[PDB]
A paper describes a structure:
The Alc. vinosum LH1–RC complexes used for cryo-EM analysis were purified using two different methods: (i) one-step extraction using n-dodecyl β-D-maltopyranoside (DDM) followed by sucrose density gradient centrifugation (hereafter designated as sucrose-density), and (ii) two-step solubilization by lauryldimethylamine N-oxide (LDAO) and n-octyl β-D-glucopyranoside (OG) followed by DEAE chromatography using DDM and CaCl2. The two structures are virtually identical in both protein conformation and cofactor arrangement with a root-mean-square deviation (RMSD) of 0.37 Å for the mainchain Cα carbons but they differ in the number of divalent cations bound to the RC Cyt-subunit. A total of six Ca ions are located on the periplasmic side of the Alc. vinosum LH1 complex and are divided into two groups: four on one side of the LH1 ring and two on the opposite side.
The photosynthetic apparatus of Alc. vinosum consists of two light-harvesting (LH) complexes, LH1 and LH2, and the reaction center (RC) complex. The Alc. vinosum LH1 is a closed ring structure composed of 16 pairs of αβ-polypeptides, 32 bacteriochlorophylls (BChl) a, and 16 all-trans spirilloxanthins that are uniformly distributed around the RC. The cryo-EM structure of the Alc. vinosum LH1–RC complex identified three forms of α-polypeptides (six α1, nine α2, and one α3) and two forms of β-polypeptides (ten β1 and six β3).
Numbering used by the authors:
A (entry chain L): 2 to 278
B (entry chain C): 23 to 333
C (entry chain 3): 5 to 66
D (entry chain Q): 5 to 47
E (entry chain Y): 1 to 64
F (entry chain H): 1 to 259
G (entry chain M): 2 to 319
H (entry chain W): 1 to 54
The structure:
C-alpha cells in the first residue's frame, strides 16, 4: 500500500540506470534498477550464509544456532588470493555480495532522493557506514596483505574477532582514534536523547497546555547549559557526531595493524618523552 | 606511525584473529640487537681433568681442563669482555674466592646448569647461557627491583598504579607486577571458572594486577595477548596456545631463579646492585627475552658448552 | 582532438588528471616500498640480518 | 557592613552560603570518619 | 633571480603572509629543537660535555 | 534468592527475556505512534473493495491525540482523516506499483517533486503572536551580520546561468534569527517571488545567487503570496515545492538515466 | 554545488533573546548574551543567558568539591609536581578503596578521598537532575529530558554505587581518571569473562549503534528536507507539510516503513535511553548473578565453537 | 636593521602583537625552565648543590 498522502509523489524518472524498465514499486518499496540488483545481491549473500551454516566449520561443529553460525574468512596463508569455498572462499563471495547489496541500497536511495527532489544527505551518510564496512573487510585486509584479516560473518563470532583484534594491541582503549570515535558515539547518544526529549517535551507539553514554540526550545537549553544550537543545527550536529564517530572508528581500526603494530598505550610515549618533562 | 604491511603470524583458527603482527623493519632492528655469539671451537677431547689439577672448582669439577679453559674463555666473552679475566678473579690467585664476582658467578653457573637441565618445560633444549642475560655486560641490562613507584607525600599511601610506566607498556596499570608474581607466588588467576557465582571473591583490582603482569610479559616477548590466549576466554587452557603452557613454567622458573639464586646472593652483592627497598637486581621475562618471543630469537648457544648442564 | 575540451572543463579536467596522476604516483611508490626488494629506504648497502644457530625471525604459526 | 547586601543578592548568597556550609560540614565529617583516630562508629 | 618579484604582494596579503611566516618559523624552530633534544647525539643538555657535575647518589630502579 | 532459577534457567536469562517482552511491547507502541500520519493506507486493496478493507497493517491505529496550537489557532488531531485528493498525473503502465507521468507542464503540475499538501492558510506565529517569517523591511531590528555579505542587490541566476533577477529583500525567521527566503525581483515582469534559502547557492565573490533547481525563465511561475509582508504555512509549501520540481523537471537530462 | 545546509552562509543578527518569561518568583537569568560569529556559522550565534537557580548553585558547589578532590589527589599522586601532573595527567586518577576495606570508610589516601569525591559528584549529578526537572517545569514543558537524564544517572549509579554495594566492596567501583577508568573498563570485562557475552552488553551496543544510526538517519533526513522547512519540526508535527511527507515517504520507499515527524523523536528518545538502561542492568547482573559471561554463554548455547587448531596443555590438571 | 622598519605597525595590529609576544614569551620561558628541570644536570632544585640538607 501507500501512505494517504503518498500517491502524488509516485512519479516516473529520477533513475540513475535502467529508465522505465525497473522504475516501479513493490508494496511500499521502490525497487528501480538497484533494488533489483540489491535484492539478488542480498538474496545470494543470505543463501550462501545459510549454506555456510549448513556445512559449518566442519560436520561435527555444524550448527544452526543463530548465535553460533559463523562464516569465517580464509587463513592468512592465502594472502589476497581466492580461497577454496569451504576454506574461506564462501566468505569472500558473501563479502562481494554484501558490498554489492550495500552500494545498491545506497544508489537506490539516490534514485529515491531524485524522485522526491530532496537533498542527498541520507545516501551520503549511509556511505560512511559502507566505508566503515569497506575498511573492515577490504582496505585493512589489503593493507595487512591477506583477506583473512576480515571479520567473520557470525553474530557472536565477529565479537570474538573484535576481542582478539583489540588484544592484539594489548590495551585497545589507548588507541587515540578509538578514544576520539568513542567520544563522538557517546556524545551522539547524549545529543540524541537531548534532541528527542526537547521535541517530545514541546509537542507533548504539560497537562492542559498548548504546544510550545521555537522560543521555548531555545530558552530551555539556554536555561540549562547557557547555549542553544538551534532547531536546524541540532540535526547538523547529530549528523556530524554520527558520521565523525564512524569516520574515526574507520581510522582507529585501519591504523591498528597497518600503521601501528605495538601496544596502543606505547603510542603515547611520544607525549611522555617530550623534553618538557 | 608505521607503514604497512606487517609480517603476520597466524596462531589460532581463521577469523578468530589470534595473530602476531611484526613491523619488518622494527623486527630487523630487534634481531640485529639480539644476535648470538659464535660458539668457541670445540675443546680437545682427553687431557688432564679439573678435579686433579685445579684446587677450588666446586661446580665445574666434572669437566676436563680443555673444556674448563674453553668455558672460562666463553664466560669472559659473555659476562666481562671489557673487564677481562680479572673481573671475577683475584689477580695471581685463580682459586681465591675473595671477590664477590667469583662467588656470584659460581652461583650463576649453578643457575644456568639447573636451568638447562631442570626447566626444559620452558627452555626446551635451547637452554640458556651467561650471554642470554648479560649480553657482554657484567650487569644484565634488563633487571628489576621492587618499585616504590612515583614519589608520594609522606602521608599518602602509594597506589602503585595510575602512573605512566614502561613496566606495563605505558598503561596506567599497577606498575610493579614483578614483585607479587615473578618473585613472590601470588595467584595470577582472577577469572571465575563457573557460569554462575560460586565463591570466587577475587577483586576487580586484582584483575588489574594480572593485567599489569600480562602487559609486562607481552612486552618482554614482543608479542600480544593472542600469542598465548584466546581473548574471548582468557582463563581457558583448551583455547590457549602451547606458548601459554611454556609461559606458565617460565613464571615458576623465574620465581625459582629469583627466590633460590638471586635472593641468597643479596649479601654478597654491593649496594649498587640493590633497589631502594634493598632487594637485589632480579630476573624478569625481559632479562632473557629482551623483546623477542625467544631469547636471541631462538639461537642455540648452550648445547656447545657441556659446562652449562648438570651432571 | 580538441573535441575532448569542448565537452570537458579544462579546469576540472586538469584538476582531476593532476590529482589522478599524483595519486597514482603515490600508490606506485608505496607499492615499491611494500616489497623489500624495491624498498630503497632500506639503504643502497642494505644487507638482511644473518640468522644462525637455529634463529627464526618469526614465531611458528599456522 | 550591612551594605554588603546592596551588592550581594541575599537570596543567591544564602543558598550559596548554606550550600557551602553543608558541603563543608559533610566534608569534615567524612574526613573524621576516614581517620581511624576519630571515627566514632567503631568499637 | 626575478627582477619583478615584488609583484607577489599584489596577490598574497602582506599581513597574513607575515603572520603565517612568523607563526610557521616559530613552530619549525620549536620542532627542530624538540627533535634534537629527543636524540641522544644532539641533546646538548644531557650529552655529558662539559662533564656534568651532578651525582645520582640513590638506589636506582633499573626497570624504569 | 540465588542466581539459578532451575538447573538451566538463571536470573540473567530471565532478565534478558524480560527485556524482550518489554522491547516487543515498546516496538508496538512506537509503531502505533508512527501510524498517526498517513493512515489508513491508500491501496488497490481498499479501492477494489470499495473502502470495505482498511490497510493499516499491524499494529492498528491508535486513538486520536490532540495538539492544542498556541494563540488559539485550533486543535489538530494526529491520527486524523483527510479528504481524498486527486493527483495531476496518469500512470505510465496499469500494473500495480507503476509510477505516474505528470499531466501538462511538469513544473506546474503539482505532482511528484513539485507535489505539496495543503497546509493551514495562516502564518506561523512567534511566541508573542507576531508572524515569524517576515521580510527584513518589517523586521527592522534584524540585520545581516557584519562579516557576511548582504544578499540584497545580489543577482539571481538559474540552472543555465541566465540572470533571473535581483534579491530585493531577505525574509528571516523572527523566533530563530536565520534567513528563510530571498525575495527576488524577476527581471521579466517585475514581480517579486520568494526563493527559499535551501535552493540558494551564494557566490560571495561575484555577489551572485545560483539556483540550480530551476531555469531563469521558471521564476515567473513561482507561487506568490496574498500578503507581501507575510507568508502562510500553505504558501511556504507551495513555494518550496515549485523549486523542488525543478530538480526533476527543469531539464530533460534530469529525469535520467545516466546510462 | 547545491546548498547542503551544513554551514550558514549569511547570518542575521537580532537583539539577543532574553528567553521565554519564567513564572513569578524565579531568579532572573544571569549573563549578558553575546554573539559568536563562528557559533552562528554552524548553529545559533547567541551564547547565554543561563539560568542559575538554587539547585544549579548547589550542584556547582557539590560538583566543584568532587572535581577539586579528584584533582588534588591526582596532584598528590605525583608528589605535588605540577610538571609531572601535566605529563601523567591522562594516567593519573583517584583510586577507589582497596578490597580489604569492604564497604567501610578507609583512610584518606587509601580510598577515603574517593568516597568523598564519589559522594559529592553523585550529589551534584542528582542536584543537576533536579535542575533539569525544574527548568522544564518552569517552561510548561514535559519531563522527557529528566527521564532520559535519570536513565543515564541510573547507569552512573550502577557503575560506582549500586553494584559495589551489591558486591560488598568499594574496590569494584570506577576510578576517577582518564586512563584509569579505561583500565577499569578493560579489567571489568577481563575479570568477569569477556563482557562481549553479556546479553545486556550486546543490547546496549545495539542501542548505542542504533543511536548513531538514528541520528545519522534523522539528521540527514531533516537536512535533506530542510529546503522545505523540515528543520521547523514543531510546525511539521502540528501541521504536516511537504517536508514531513517527503521524509516519511523516502523511508517508506527505502525500507518499507516509516515514522512521523513526531514519532521519530520517540524512536530517538528510546534508543538513547535504552543504551544506558541496558548498560546499567548488564552491570548489575555482572558479578552478582553471573560470574563468567563466556561460560554463561556456553551454558545457554550462545558462544560459537571453533575447530581446535591450537590448544594448550593445562599445567594445573596434573 | 632596515631603516624603514617602523612601517610593520601599519600592517600588524600593535595590540595583537604585544598580546601574542607576551603570551609566547611567557610560554617559552615556562617551557625552557621545564626542559631544564626535566634534565638531571640542569635541575637546579634537585642537583644537591649546595650541600645536602635533606
Ligand atoms: C535490539 C535491537 C535489535 C532487535 C532485533 C531487530 C531484528 C531486525 C529487525 C528487522 C525488521 C525488518 C522490517 C522490514 C519491513 C518490511 C516492510 C514492511 O512491510 O513493514 C511492516 C511493518 C509496518 O507495516 P505497514 O507498513 O503498516 O503495513 C503495510 C500494509 O500491511 C501493506 O500490506 P501488504 O499486503 O503489502 O503487507 C505485506 C507486508 C507484510 O510484512 C510483514 O510480514 C512484516 C515484515 C517484517 C517482520 O509486506 C510488505 O508490505 C512488502 C510487500 C512485499 C515486498 C517484499 C520484498 C520487497 C522487495 C523490494 C526490495 C528492494 C530493495 O514495519 C515494521 O514492522 C518495522 C519493524 C521495526 C523493528 C525495529 C527493531 C530494530 C531496531 C531497534 C533499535 C531502534 C531503537 C528502538 C527503541
Ligand atoms: C567528632 C565528630 C562528632 C561530631 C562533632 C561535631 C562538631 C565539632 C560539629 C558538629 C556539627 C554537626 N554535626 Mg556532628 N559530630 C558527630 C557526628 C554527627 C552525625 C552522625 C550520624 O554521626 C551527624 C548526622 C552529625 C551532624 C551534625 C550537624 C547537626 C552539624 C553540622 C551542621 C552543618 O553542617 O550546617 C551547615 C549547613 C547548613 C545548611 C547551614 C544552614 C543551617 C540552617 C539551614 C539555617 C538555620 C538558621 C538558624 C537561625 C541558625 C542556627 C542553625 C543551627 C544548626 C540550629 N554529627 C561526631 C559524634 N559535629 C557542627 C555544628 O554543631 O553546627 C551547628 C559542628 O561544629
Ligand atoms: C577488546 C576490544 C577493544 C575494542 C576493540 C575494537 C575493534 C577491533 C574494533 C572496535 C571498533 C569500535 N569500538 Mg572498540 N574496543 C573496545 C572497547 C570499546 C568500548 C568500551 C565501552 O569499552 C566502546 C564504546 C568501543 C567503541 C568502538 C567504536 C568506536 C567502534 C565500533 C563502531 C563502528 O565501528 O561503526 C562502524 C559501523 C559499521 C562497520 C556497520 C556497517 C553497516 C553496514 C554498511 C550495513 C549492514 C546492513 C545489514 C546487513 C542489514 C541487515 C538487514 C536487517 C533485516 C536489518 N570500543 C575494547 C577495548 N573496537 C571497530 C571499528 O572501529 O570499526 C570501524 C573495530 O573494528
Ligand atoms: C638555569 C636555570 C636558572 C635560571 C636561568 C634563567 C635564564 C637564562 C633566564 C631566566 C629567565 C627568568 N627566570 Mg630563571 N632561572 C632559574 C630559576 C628560576 C625560578 C625558580 C623558581 O627556580 C623562577 C621562578 C625563574 C624565573 C625567571 C623569570 C624571572 C625569567 C623568565 C622571564 C619570562 O618568562 O618572560 C616573560 C616576560 C614577558 C612576557 C614580558 C617581558 C617584557 C617586559 C614587558 C619588559 C621588561 C624589561 C626588563 C626585563 C625590565 C627591567 C628594566 C631594566 C632597567 C632593563 N627562574 C634557574 C636558577 N632564568 C629569563 C629572563 O631573565 O627574562 C627576563 C632568562 O633569560
Ligand atoms: C554512518 C553512521 C551510522 C549509520 C548510518 C546509516 N545507516 C544506514 C543509513 C544511514 C544513514 C541508511 O540510509 C540505511 C537504511 O536504509 O537505514 C534504514 C542504513 C542501514 N544501516 C543498517 C545497519 C547498520 N548500520 C550500522 C551503523 C551505522 N549506520 C553508523 C553507526 C550498523 C552497525 C554499527 O552494526 C548496522 C547493523 C541497515 C538497517 C541499513 C542498510 C540496509 C542494507 O544495506 O540493505 C542491503 C542488505 C540486506 C537487505 C541484507 C544483507 C545482505 C548481505 C549480503 C548479508 C551479509 C551481511 C554481512 C557481510 C554478514 C553479516 C553480518 C555479521 C556481523 C553478523
Ligand atoms: C541517554 C544516555 C546518554 C546521556 C544522557 C543525558 N546526559 C545528560 C542529560 C541527558 C538526558 C542531561 O539532561 C544532562 C545535561 O545537563 O545535559 C546537557 C546530562 C549531562 N551529561 C553530562 C555528561 C556526560 N554524559 C554522558 C553520557 C550520556 N548522557 C549517555 C550516552 C557522559 C559519558 C559518555 O561519559 C558524560 C561525561 C553532563 C554534561 C550533564 C550533567 C552535568 C552535571 O550533572 O553537572 C553537575 C555539576 C558539576 C559537575 C559542576 C562541576 C563543574 C564546575 C565548572 C566546577 C566549578 C564551579 C565553580 C567555579 C566553583 C567555585 C568554588 C566553590 C568552592 C564554590
Ligand atoms: C521469513 C522469511 C521470508 C525469510 C526469508 C529471508 C530471505 C531468504 C531473504 C531476505 C533478505 C532480503 C533479500 C532482503 C531484501 C531487501 C529488504 C526486503 C530489506 C528490508 C528493509 C530493511 C533492511 C529494514 C530494516 C529496518 C531496520 C531494522 C532498522 C532501520 C532503522 C530504524 C530503527 C528505523 C525506525 C525509525 C524510522 C522509521 C526512521 C525513518 C524516519 C527518519 C529517520 C526521519 O528522520 C523522519 C522524519 C520525518 C518523518 C518520518 C521519518 C522517518 O520515518
Ligand atoms: C579548576 O579545577 C582545579 C584546578 C581546582 C582542580 C582540577 C581538577 C582536575 C583536573 C580534575 C580532573 C578530573 C578527571 C580527569 C576526572 C575523570 C573522571 C572520570 C573519567 C570518571 C569516570 C567514571 C567515574 C565513575 C563512574 C564514578 C562513579 C562513582 C560513584 C557513582 C560513587 C558514588 C559514591 C557514593 C554515593 C559514596 C558514598 C560514600 C558513603 C560511604 C556514604 O560515604 C560515607
Ligand atoms: C654462567 C653464566 C653466568 C655468569 C658467569 C654470570 C656471572 C654473573 C656475575 C659475575 C654477576 C655479578 C656481576 C656484578 O654484580 O657486577 C652476575 C649477576 C647477575 N646475573 Fe649473572 N651470570 C651468568 C648467567 C646468568 C643468567 C642466565 C641470568 C639470567 C637468568 C643472569 C642474571 C644475573 C642477574 C640478574 C644478576 C644481578 C645483577 C648484577 O649483580 O649485576 N646471569 N652474573
Ligand atoms: C591513492 C592514495 C593512497 C596512496 C598510497 C597507498 C596507501 C598507503 C597509504 C600510506 C601508507 C604509509 O606508509 O603511511 C605511513 C603513515 C605513518 O601512515 C599514516 O599516517 C596513515 C594513517 C591512516 C590514515 C588513513 C589511511 C587510509 C585508510 C582508509 C581510510 C578511510 C576513512 C573513511 C572511511 C569511511
Ligand atoms: C541496592 C543494594 C541492595 C542491597 C544489597 C546488599 C548487599 C551487601 C551485602 C549484605 C549482606 C552482607 N553480609 C556479609 C552480611 O552478607
Ligand atoms: Ca618493547
Ligand atoms: Ca652539554
Ligand atoms: Ca641546587
Ligand atoms: Fe528532529
Ligand atoms: Mg587502576
Amino acid at each position: 500500500a501507500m501512505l494517504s498522502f503518498e500517491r502524488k509523489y509516485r512519479v516516473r524518472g529520477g533513475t540513475l540506470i535502467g529508465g522505465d524498465l525497473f522504475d516501479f514499486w513493490v508494496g511500499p518499496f521502490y525497487v528501480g534498477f538497484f533494488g533489483v540488483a540489491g535484492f539478488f545481491f542480498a538474496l545470494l549473500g543470505v543463501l550462501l550464509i545459510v549454506w555456510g551454516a549448513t556445512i559449518g566449520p566442519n560436520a561435527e561443529l555444524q550448527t544452526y544456532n543463530i548465535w553460533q553460525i559463523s562464516i569465517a574468512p580464509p587463513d592468512l596463508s592465502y594472502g589476497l588470493g581466492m580461497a577454496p569455498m569451504t576454506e574461506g572462499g564462501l566468505w569472500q563471495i558473501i563479502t562481494i555480495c554484501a558490498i554489492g547489496a550495500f552500494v545498491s541500497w545506497a544508489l537506490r536511495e539516490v534514485e529515491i532522493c531524485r524522485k522526491l527532489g530532496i537533498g542527498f544527505h541520507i545516501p551520503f551518510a549511509f556511505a560512511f557506514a559502507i566505508g566503515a564496512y569497506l575498511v573492515l573487510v577490504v582496505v585493512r585486509p589489503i593493507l595487512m596483505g591477506a583477506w583473512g584479516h576480515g571479520f567473520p560473518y557470525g553474530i557472536l563470532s565477529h565479537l570474538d574477532w573484535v576481542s582478539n583484534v583489540g588484544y592484539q594491541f594489548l590495551h585497545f582503549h589507548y588507541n587515540p582514534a578509538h578514544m576520539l570515535a568513542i567520544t563522538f558515539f557517546f556524545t551522539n547518544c547524549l545529543a540524541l536523547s537531548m534532541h528527542g526529549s526537547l521535541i517530545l517535551s514541546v509537542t507533548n507539553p504539560q497537562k492542559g497546555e498548548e504546544v510550545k514554540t521555537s522560543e521555548h526550545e531555545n530558552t530551555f537549553f539556554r536555561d540549562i547549559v547557557g547555549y542553544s544550537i538551534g532547531a536546524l543545527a541540532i540535526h547538523r550536529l547529530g549528523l556530524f557526531l554520527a558520521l565523525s564517530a564512524v569516520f574515526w572508528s574507520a581510522v582507529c581500526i585501519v591504523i591498528s595493524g597497518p600503521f601501528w603494530t605495538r601496544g596502543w598505550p606505547e603510542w603515547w610515549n611520544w607525549w611522555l618523552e617530550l623534553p618538557l618533562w | 606511525c608505521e607503514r604497512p604491511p606487517p609480517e603476520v603470524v597466524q596462531k589460532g583458527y581463521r577469523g578468530v584473529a589470534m595473530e602476531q603482527n611484526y613491523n619488518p623493519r622494527l623486527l630487523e632492528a630487534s634481531i640485529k640487537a639480539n644476535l648470538p655469539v659464535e660458539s668457541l671451537p670445540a675443546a680437545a677431547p682427553g687431557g688432564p681433568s679439573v678435579s686433579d689439577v685445579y684446587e677450588n672448582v666446586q661446580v665445574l669439577k666434572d669437566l676436563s681442563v680443555a673444556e674448563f679453559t674453553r668455558t672460562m674463555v666463553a664466560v669472559t666473552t659473555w659476562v666481562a669482555p671489557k673487564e677481562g679475566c680479572n673481573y671475577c678473579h683475584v689477580p695471581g690467585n685463580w682459586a681465591s674466592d675473595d671477590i664477590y664476582t667469583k662467588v656470584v658467578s659460581r652461583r650463576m653457573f649453578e643457575l644456568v646448569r639447573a636451568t638447562n637441565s631442570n626447566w626444559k618445560d620452558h627452555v626446551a633444549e635451547t637452554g640458556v647461557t651467561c650471554y642470554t642475560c648479560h649480553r657482554g655486560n657484567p650487569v644484565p641490562k634488563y633487571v628489576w627491583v621492587t618499585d616504590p613507584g612515583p614519589n608520594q607525600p609522606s602521608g599518602v599511601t602509594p597506589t602503585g598504579q595510575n602512573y605512566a610506566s614502561s613496566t606495563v607498556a605505558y598503561s596506567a596499570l599497577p606498575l610493579d607486577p614483578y614483585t607479587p608474581f615473578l618473585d613472590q607466588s601470588n595467584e595470577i588467576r582472577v577469572i571465575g571458572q563457573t557460569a554462575l557465582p560460586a565463591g570466587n571473591t577475587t577483586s576487580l583490582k586484582q584483575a588489574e594486577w594480572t593485567y599489569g603482569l600480562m602487559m609486562q610479559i607481552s612486552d618482554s616477548l614482543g608479542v600480544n595477548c593472542t600469542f598465548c590466549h584466546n581473548s574471548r576466554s582468557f582463563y581457558d587452557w583448551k583455547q590457549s596456545t602451547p606458548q601459554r603452557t611454556t609461559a606458565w613454567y617460565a613464571i615458576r622458573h623465574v620465581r625459582d631463579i629469583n627466590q633460590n639464586y638471586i635472593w641468597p646472593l643479596n649479601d654478597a652483592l654491593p649496594a649498587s646492585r640493590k633497589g631502594p627497598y634493598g632487594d637485589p637486581f632480579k630476573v624478569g621475562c625481559m632479562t632473557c627475552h629482551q623483546g623477542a618471543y625467544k631469547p636471541l630469537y631462538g639461537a642455540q648457544m648452550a648445547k656447545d658448552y657441556p659446562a652449562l648442564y648438570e651432571s | 582532438l580538441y573535441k575532448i575540451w569542448l565537452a570537458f572543463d579544462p579546469r576540472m579536467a586538469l584538476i582531476g588528471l593532476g590529482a589522478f596522476l599524483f595519486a597514482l604516483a603515490l600508490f606506485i611508490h608505496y607499492m615499491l616500498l611494500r616489497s623489500p626488494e624495491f624498498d630503497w629506504l632500506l639503504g643502497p648497502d642494505y644487507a638482511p640480518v644473518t640468522l644462525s644457530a637455529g634463529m627464526s625471525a618469526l614465531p611458528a604459526g599456522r | 557592613m550591612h551594605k554588603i547586601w546592596q551588592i550581594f543578592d541575599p537570596r543567591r548568597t544564602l543558598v550559596a552560603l548554606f550550600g557551602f556550609l553543608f558541603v563543608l560540614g559533610l566534608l569534615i565529617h567524612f574526613i573524621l570518619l576516614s581517620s581511624p583516630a576519630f571515627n566514632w562508629l567503631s568499637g | 633571480m626575478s627582477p619583478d618579484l615584488w609583484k607577489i604582494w599584489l596577490l598574497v596579503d602582506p599581513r597574513r603572509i607575515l603572520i603565517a611566516v612568523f607563526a610557521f618559523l616559530t613552530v619549525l624552530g620549536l620542532a627542530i629543537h624538540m627533535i634534537l633534544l629527543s636524540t641522544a647525539e644532539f641533546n646538548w643538555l644531557e650529552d655529558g660535555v662539559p662533564a656534568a657535575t651532578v651525582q645520582q647518589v640513590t638506589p636506582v630502579v633499573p626497570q624504569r | 534468592m540465588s542466581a539459578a532459577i532451575t538447573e538451566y534457567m538463571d536470573v540473567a536469562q530471565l532478565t534478558i527475556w524480560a527485556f524482550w517482552f518489554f522491547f516487543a511491547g515498546l516496538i508496538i507502541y512506537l509503531r502505533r505512534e508512527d501510524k498517526r500520519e498517513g493512515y489508513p493506507l491508500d491501496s488497490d486493496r481498499t479501492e477494489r473493495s470499495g473502502g470495505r478493507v482498511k490497510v493499516v497493517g499491524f499494529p492498528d491505529l491508535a486513538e486520536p491525540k490532540t495538539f492544542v496550537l498556541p494563540h488559539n489557532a485550533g486543535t489538530v488531531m494526529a491520527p486524523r482523516v483527510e479528504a481524498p485528493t486527486s493527483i495531476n498525473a496518469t500512470p505510465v503502465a496499469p500494473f500495480p506499483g507503476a509510477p505516474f507521468e505528470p499531466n501538462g507542464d511538469p513544473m506546474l503540475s503539482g505532482f511528484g517533486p513539485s507535489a505539496s499538501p495543503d497546509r493551514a492558510k495562516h502564518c506561523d506565529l512567534t511566541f508573542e503572536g507576531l508572524p515569524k517569517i517576515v521580510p527584513l523591511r518589517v523586521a527592522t531590528d534584524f540585520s545581516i551580520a557584519e562579516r557576511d555579505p548582504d544578499p540584497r542587490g545580489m543577482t539571481v541566476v538559474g540552472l543555465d546561468g541566465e540572470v533571473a533577477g535581483t534579491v530585493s529583500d531577505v525574509w528571516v525567521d523572527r523566533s530563530e534569527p536565520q534567513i528563510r527566503y530571498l525575495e527576488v525581483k524577476v527581471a521579466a515582469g517585475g514581480k517579486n517571488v520568494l526563493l527559499p534559502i535551501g535552493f540558494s547557492r551564494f557566490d560571495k565573490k561575484a555577489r551572485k545567487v545560483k539556483v540550480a533547481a530551476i531555469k531563469a525563465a521558471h521564476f515567473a511561475n513561482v507561487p506568490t503570496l496574498a500578503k507581501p509582508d507575510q507568508i502562510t504555512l500553505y504558501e511556504e509549501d507551495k513555494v518550496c515545492a515549485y523549486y523542488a520540481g525543478g530538480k526533476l523537471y527543469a531539464t530533460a537530462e534530469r529525469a535520467g538515466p545516466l546510462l | 554545488p547545491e546548498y547542503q545546509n551544513i554551514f550558514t552562509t549569511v547570518q542575521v543578527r537580532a537583539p539577543a533573546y532574553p528567553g521565554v518569561p519564567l513564572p513569578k518568583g524565579s531568579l532572573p537569568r544571569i549573563g549578558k548574551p553575546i554573539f559568536s560569529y563562528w557559533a552562528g556559522k554552524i548553529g545559533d550565534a547567541q551564547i547565554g543567558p543561563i539560568y542559575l537557580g538554587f539547585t544549579g548553585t548547589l550542584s556547582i558547589i557539590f560538583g566543584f568539591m568532587a572535581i577539586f578532590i579528584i584533582g588534588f589527589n591526582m596532584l598528590a599522586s605525583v608528589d605535588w609536581n605540577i610538571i609531572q601532573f601535566v605529563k601523567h595527567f591522562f594516567w593519573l586518577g583517584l583510586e577507589p578503596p582497596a578490597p580489604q576495606y569492604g564497604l567501610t570508610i578507609p583512610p584518606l589516601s587509601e580510598g577515603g578521598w574517593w568516597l568523598m569525591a564519589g559522594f559529592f559528584l553523585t550529589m551534584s549529578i542528582l542536584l543537576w537532575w533536579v535542575r533539569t526537572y525544574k527548568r522544564a517545569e518552569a517552561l510548561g514543558m514535559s519531563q522527557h529530558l529528566s527521564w532520559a537524564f535519570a536513565a543515564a544517572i541510573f547507569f552512573y549509579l550502577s557503575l560506582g554505587f549500586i553494584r559495589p554495594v551489591m558486591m560488598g566492596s568499594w574496590a569494584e567501583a570506577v576510578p576517577f581518571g582518564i586512563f584509569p577508568h579505561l583500565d577499569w573498563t578493560a579489567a571489568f570485562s577481563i575479570r568477569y569473562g569477556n563482557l562481549y557475552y553479556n546479553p545486556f552488553h550486546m543490547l546496549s551496543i545495539a542501542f548505542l549503534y542504533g543511536s548513531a544510526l538514528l541520528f545519522a538517519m534523522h539528521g540527514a533526513t531533516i537536512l535533506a528536507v530542510s529546503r522545505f522547512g523540515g528543520d521547523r519540526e514543531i510546525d511539521q508535527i502540528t501541521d504536516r507539510g511537504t517536508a514531513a511527507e517527503r521524509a516519511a515517504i523516502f523511508w517508506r520507499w527505502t525500507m518499507g516503513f516509516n515514522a512521523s515527524m513526531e514519532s521519530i523523536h520517540r524512536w530517538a528518545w528510546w534508543c538513547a535511553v535504552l543504551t544506558v538502561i541496558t548498560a546499567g542492568i548488564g552491570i548489575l547482573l555482572t558479578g552478582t548473578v553471573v560470574e563468567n559471561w563466556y561460560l554463561w554463554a556456553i551454558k545457554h548455547g550462545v558462544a560459537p565453537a571453533y575447530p581446535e587448531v591450537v590448544t594448550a596443555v593445562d599445567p594445573y590438571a596434573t
